[model samples]
Target: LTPPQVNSILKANEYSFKVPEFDGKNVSSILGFDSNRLPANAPIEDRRSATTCLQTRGMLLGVFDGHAGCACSQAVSERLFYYIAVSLLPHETLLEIENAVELLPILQWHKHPNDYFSKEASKLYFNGLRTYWQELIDLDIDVKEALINAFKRLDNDISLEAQVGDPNSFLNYLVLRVAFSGATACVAHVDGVDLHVANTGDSRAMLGVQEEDGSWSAVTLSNDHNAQNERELQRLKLEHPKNEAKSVVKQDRLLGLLMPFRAFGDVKFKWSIDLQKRVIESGPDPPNYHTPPYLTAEPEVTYHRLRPQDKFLVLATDGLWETMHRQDVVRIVGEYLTGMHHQQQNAATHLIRHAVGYRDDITIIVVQFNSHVVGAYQNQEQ
Candidate 1:
C-alpha cells in the first residue's frame, strides 16, 4: 500500500498519526517456509508492527503468529494494532493491560485440574502458569482488557462475514483456521509511567525489572499456549486414555504431539458432544462421561503493568523462547539496551542477534519507553 493511501485509510479509520517522529525503523520481520509433508503448508504466517503514537510518549509493538499462512497474522497485525493505536485510549496503554487479565483467566482455569498428573508434568505445567501470572502482573492492566475486546471484535467480524460468504471470507477463513490451530501473540505500548502488555498464544513478551538491590530479573509479560500446556495434557489424556491395546508410538505411546495445550487453527481437535462421548468411552468412566474429550477453547492470555527499571521489552515467537531461557535473553537484551548509544538504531538488531543465534525463525520488537513521559501518559484520562 502507498504512503498516501495508507495515510488516507488512517484518517478515515482514525489510525495513528503519520508523524515522522513517531515512525521508527520498522523493527518488524518475518520468515516463511513450505513443508513437504502437509498438503498445503506454505509460508507459515508471521508479522510484526511498531509505531510511536504521534503526540504521545507511548510506543506500540506487536507480533502475530499466523498458522494457515501469514495472511491472517499479517492482516491482524497490520489493521488491529493500527486501529487500536489511534482509537480507544489513543495515548494510553490500558487497552493492552485489560486484555491480559481477560484472556489469562480462561487459560489458567482450564489448566487448574491438570496440576496433579505426574511430578514432571506438574512441574512443567505449573511453572508455565506461574510465569504467566507473574508476567501478567508486570504488564499494563488496561491494555489487556482492550486487547480482549479487540480480538473479540475481530473474531466476531470474521464469524459474521464468514457465514454469509462475504468478500472478507478469505480473511475469516485464515483467521478462524488459526483459532483452530491457535496463535501466540503479544501487543504492548510504552510511553513515559505507562506500560501495557497484552498477549495470547505461545509468543512472549518480557520485562527486565530491576530489583531493590539494583540487579535486574527477566519478568515475562505474557503466557504461552502450546500442546504441552497443562490443559492440553488433560484433554489428551481424556481423549485417549492409557490403553495397552492401542499402538504405542513413543516410549509412552499415549504421549503424542510435544505441544500439549494452546493453539488457534485446528478445528478438528475441538471438543464437542461427540468428542465427550468418545472421551468417556476411551476412559475408565465409560458409562458416565458427560464432558468432552477435546479442548473447548484456546489458551488464556495475560497482561502486565510496566514499571521503572522495566527498561526494555521483547516480543517474540515460540522459536525464540524454545531455545533461549528468559533470564538469558533478558541479560543479553539488558546489556544491549544499557550499552548501545543509539537505542532506536540498534535495539531490534541486538534482539534478533539472540533470536537467530538459537537457529529459530526470529521476529523481535524492542521498545524503550521514554521514562521522562510515562507518568504523564498514565495519568491521562482515557
Candidate 2:
C-alpha cells in the first residue's frame, strides 16, 4: 500500500483524554453517555448531544435514534437543540449569532468536543442557523414557548434543508440521506424552575425522583412504543376496551408496543420488589386514554417543578442495552450513580458493564443533580 494512499485516514484511529486527578468525579460534569459504533455497510446512526445552554439557562441534553440510516440522527444530534437553545438565549447573544455571522463563540459544548466535524457544509450549517436565529428574532418567545416554536418550525425545515440541496457531493448525499431516513429526538432542557421534555418519536425522558427512604422512583417524561418496559402493553390494552380481539395483544406485543415500523420507548420501580400486589393496592387502574394513541405518533410531555428530591434525569432512545427493564435500569442507575456505597467515575462505563455488553445500538445519558445544582441553576454557568 502506498504511504499517501493507504494512510490517508489513519490520522483518526484513536483519541484520548486523562485528567490529572481529584475524587475523579470532582468536576462540574456529573452526567455520562455511552454507545459504540460498529462498522460495515449498516453501521451506527444514533447520535447524542449535551452542552451548557450558555447565555440562557440550564443544559440541553438529547439522544437521537435514527432509522434506515445515521444521516438524520447525526443531524439531530449535530444541530437539533442548537435551534432551541438559540430560541431562548439573551437577545444580545442571538444578535451576536445573527449579525456577526462571524461570531466568536457561544454554546460551550459539554460532550461537544465534537471529535470530528464536517467541513464541507460549514457555511451551510451557519446558513441554516442564521435562518433559525432570524426566525427566532421574529418571536419574543421564552423557555417552553421556545421549545414548541422551534420544534414546530423544525417539522418543516427538516425536509426542506435537504431538498433545497447542496453542492458538496458527500454532504449532498448526507442531507438527502437525512431527508429520506427518519429519526426521533428526545431533548431535555433543565433549568431552575422548569424541566422541559418533548418527544418527536418514541425517545423518552426519565426523571429519577429520590425518596427519603433512600430509594428512587422513575418518572417518564415523554411517551410511546413499548420496547422492554413492563407497563406499555397495558397502556395499549387500556387504549382499546372492546377491540380486545388480539388487536391489543399479539405475541406478547401490541401494535404500538412493538416498533416494527422502524423500531423503539420506560417506568416506575415497583414497591420493594413486589410490583403486582403494590400496583393493585396503591390505587385503581387508569381509566381510559386516547386523546388519540393509535392514530398518530404525537408527542407527550411531562413537566416537573424543580425540587429538593428530584435526584437525576435519564434521556435515551427508550431501551438500555435491550434486556434491562425500565425499573431495573433506573434503580441500578440510582444505586450506582447515587447509591454512594460504591462509586463509578463514569456513569456510561459502569452502565455498559452493568448491561453486560458493549456491542449494541442502545444509547443512554444520565444527568445527575438534586438542588437545581443547589437551588439556582448550575453555579458554574460562568
Candidate 3:
C-alpha cells in the first residue's frame, strides 16, 4: 500500500486484518479483527495492539486506556507484551534469550521496530524487563501466575524509575511523566483452546459466544475496577483506615480524583503519604494527599477453556462499553461476522459509528475463532 493509501486507511483511526496461517498449518483459530480508534484529541491517549508470538504458539492482544497523559499507556503498549512473552518462555528458551542478550538485543521485535522505542529511555525500559525475567528463571510457576507477577513487577518498575530519576535529562522527565500518569490494561493471550485474560483497572475483555440456538451472548472475562464495583470499594475501605473511607472514594473516584482504583503507574496513588508529597513537590503537579497507598497494580486474571461454541473475543477500552451494552456489542459483531466475507471490511466502521459521539477515546479488537481448529484441539485433549 502507498503511503497516502496507508494514511487514508488509518486516517479515521480504523484498522482490520485477517490472521495469517503459518506453513498452511491452521494452528491459530483467530480469524481477524475490525479494530478502530476514535480519539478525543489529535494525540489519542488510547493504544491498541495485536501481535502473534514468534517463540510461543499464541497470540497477544491488548487495549490500554491512558489517563492524565499518553506517556504511561504508550510505554505499556510498547513494553508490556515483551514482559508477558518473556514470562511465558520455556526454561530452554529463556536460557537462549539470556545468551542472545550478550550478542544482540534481548527483545526481538516482529511488529515494532527498534527505532519505535525512545533511544534515551530504551536502556532503562530494557533493564527493568531484563531483571524481571532473570528473577523468573529462579521461579517455577504457571503462565497465569507469571502473568500476574509480570504486571505487578512492571508497575513497580514504573514507580521506582520515577522515584530514582535517570541521569539523562530526557529520560528522567519521561520516567516521571509515565509514573505520574496512569493507564488501564486489558490483555488477552490465546494458545490453541486455552485463553487467559489479565486485566487492570476498567478496560475489558468480553467473549462472544454462539448459543446452540444460533443466538449470540456476551461472556465477561474481566471486572471493571472502578467505583461501580462494590468489591473494589470495599477493598479500598479495608486498605485504608475507617476515618478515610468516606474521603478515600468520593464521586465514584479514588480520593475524589482518579477513576480507576487499580492501574499501572500512578505512583501518586500507590506511594506513601510522604513519598507522594515528595515526588509531587519534586516533579509535576501535586496529586491529592489525603490518602496514601490507595491504588494497586495487582491485576485480576481469568482463564477460559475455549469451546467450539465460543465464536469471538472483544477487547476494548471503556469508551466502547460506555456507549453500547455488552449484549448489543456481541450481537452487532456476530451479525457482521455471519454476513458475507466481503462485508467484514465494514464491520468496525459500523461499530465505531455507533461509539463515536462519546468524548472518550475508543479502541476495539475483535478476535474471531475458527471452530474447526478449536474442535480438533478438543478432540486431541480427549
Candidate 4:
C-alpha cells in the first residue's frame, strides 16, 4: 500500500504569555506544530491555545482537530480560548472553560449551512465553517454574546445568500449532505478545585499519579474513540436501527462505516438527527459488531482533582498516542524533565524529538502542577 502523503497542514509559534501576576515570570509552558503545510490525507486545519489567567488562578490548555483540512483546527485554537476566557467573566472557574470547550463544535455546526450535517454538504459546510470561524475571531463581539449572535448570523448568512439567488448560499448544506466530516478536540483548564477536562474526539489526556511507594502509574483522563471500544457501536445501532442492514463482514473487517460518535465536522453524519443523537448519548461498550470495524469516535474524558503526588499532565493528539503507551510516555517525559531539573523551556522540543525519533506527527503539551507551583502562583496572584 502507498504511504500517506506528507503535508504541513498548519503551524504557529506558542502564543504570547505575560501574566505580570506571576512575579513577572511566566509559570506555564506550551508547544505545538510550527509549519503551515500538511501531509496529503492529513487534515488541513487545527488549533490550540494556552493561557495562564492569574486572576482566575488556573491555566487553560486546548487542542482542535480539523476535518477535510486543518483550517478549522487552526481557527478554533487561535480564537476559541479568548472567547472562552472572555465568556468566563470575572468569577467563574475552569468548569466554565470546560463548558465553553464542549459548546464549540455545536457552535461551529450552528454557524454553517442549514444542512451542514448532510453527507453532500462538505463544500457548503466547510465554506461556512471557514467563514464563521473567521468572523468569530475577526468580529469584535462580546464573548458570550458572540456565541449567541454567531448562530443568528449563520442563519442570516444562509438566508441572505439564498435570497440573492446564489446557488452556493446553501453551499455548506450541500457539502455536509454529501460526505462525512467534522473535528475532535480536547481542552484542559487548571484551577484550584480540580483539573477540568472536556473533549469531543479521540485525542486524549492522561495523568500519571504517583503512588505512596514512589512509583508512578497512569490514570487516563480522556477516552479513545475507536471501534475497539464497545459502548460506542451499541449506541450507533440503537440510533440507526435501519442502517444495520448494510452491515458487511470480512475476515476481521466490519462492513459498516465506523463513524465517530462525536466529532466537530462530519457534516454528512451529523445531518442525520438520529445518528447525531446517538453520538451525544452513546457510551463505551465491548466490541459487539459482527465484522471488524475500521473507524470509531468514542472519546474518553475525565477529570482528576490535583493530588499532592501528581507530577505532570500530558495533552496530545492521536499522532503521539497512536505510537506510545500512556505510561511509557509519562515515564519518558518525566525522566527527561526530572533529569533536566524541571526545566521546561525546551521540554516541548525534547519531547517532540523523542516522539519523532519514533516517527510520528509529534505534538505534546506538558503542564506541571504541584503544591509549590500552585502555592507560588496563588501567593503571587494574591
Q: Between prediction 1 and prediction 2, which has the larger lDDT?
A: 2
> After superposition, which runs of candidate 3 have C-alpha atoms over 4 Å from their true positions?
1-12, 103-116, 138-140, 280-291, 340-346
- TM per candidate: 0.55, 0.68, 0.89, 0.57
122-150: candidate 2 lDDT, tens digit per residue:
67776787887886567555566677666
Shift of residue 208 alpha carbon in model 4, Å = 3.0
TM-score for candidate 4: 0.57
Best of the two (2, 3) by lDDT: 3
The TM-score that candidate 1 achieves is 0.55
Name the candidate that leads on TM-score: 3
The models' CA-based lDDT, in order, is 0.45, 0.56, 0.79, 0.47
What is the clash count of model 2? 2
Candidate 1 per-residue lDDT over residues 1-382, each given as its tens digit:
3545533422332212122333364221111000000011245455566654543445666766666455446445544553344234431333343444452211111111211112222332233233333433454225556556555444433333223322344433443343333344577755444556665666778876656675569887665655445553444555654661232113221223324243333333344546324423321212222332332222244545544456666677765677678887777766665674344524555454455433334455555544333333445634
State the weakest 10-residue window (summed lDDT) of model 2: 262-271
**Candidate 4, 149-176: lDDT as tens digits:** 4323333333333223224534433322
Q: Point out where model 2 deviates above 4 Å.
A: 1-42, 90-92, 112-115, 225-299, 339-344, 357-360, 370-382
Error of 2 at 354 (Å): 2.3
Q: lDDT score of model 3?
A: 0.79
Give candidate 3's total backbone clashes. 0
